[PDB]
Amino acid sequence: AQEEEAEQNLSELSGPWRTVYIGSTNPEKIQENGPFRTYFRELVFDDEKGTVDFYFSVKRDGKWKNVHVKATKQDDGTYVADYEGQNVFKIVSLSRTHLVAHNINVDKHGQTTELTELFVKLNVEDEDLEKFWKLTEDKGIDKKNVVNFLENENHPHPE
């Protein structure tokens, strides 16, 4: 017998995520305009399908693009996904607060690059949303006159 099945419950982890650090064996890949200079926006874990959907922004030729990539868990435990080539990636450490992964990318030229990354979750608690809503009610503000900044078609550019 090899290893045994892993009880996986990461659904709890879906939500807003941000990129802290991304390291690379090939710096050109992460330098400005690089394909893996990805600013995470959201992550969605599905335990039924055993998938991870990545939502992130990347600048391509002085222009910002919002990308969506779906990764699928393999019986190996790793995940594979198509983005600027082929990737096999591995969650080395994941918790409600963080995420450290190792990705191996093979581009359209067969060039292999190993990347490392630290990502953090933007945790918005219920106890706090309530407190903000109450206050907002008290001050007589209308829910319609409130702007959601954690998801809007008009935000700042990291560069």
CB of 26 to a copy of itself, least distance (A): 8
Amino acid identity for residue 129 in this structure: L
Amino acid at 128: D
Partner whose footprint covers residue 68, from ligand UNA, a copy of itself, none (CB < 5 to 8 Å by kind): none
| Cα–Cα distance for residue pair 64/157, rounded to 1 Å | 8
What's the distance, CA 140 to chain centroid? 36
Contact partner, 75, from ligand UNA, a copy of itself, none, Cβ < 5-8 Å per class = none
By the rule CB under 8 A, 135 interacts with a copy of itself: yes
Tokens describing residue 21: 């650090």
Which positions from 30 through 89 interact with ligand UNA, judged by CB under 6 A? 36, 38, 54, 56, 69, 71, 81, 83, 87, 89
Binding-residue total with a copy of itself (CB under 8 A): 58
What radius of gyration, in Å, describes the C-alpha atoms of the chain? 18
**Is residue 145 at the binding interface for a copy of itself, with CB under 8 A as the rule?**
yes
Q: Tell me the three state secondary structure of residue 73.
A: strand
Nearest partner of 61 among 87, 35, 38, judged by Cα: 35
Q: Give bridge partners of residue 105 from the DSSP assignment.
A: 87, 113
Stretch of residues binding ligand UNA (CB under 6 A), selected from 3-11, 97-105, 129-137, 144-152: 97-105
Among 1, 6, 126, 140, binds a copy of itself (CB under 8 A): 140
Compute the least distance from the CB of residue 117 to ligand UNA, in Å. Answer: 4
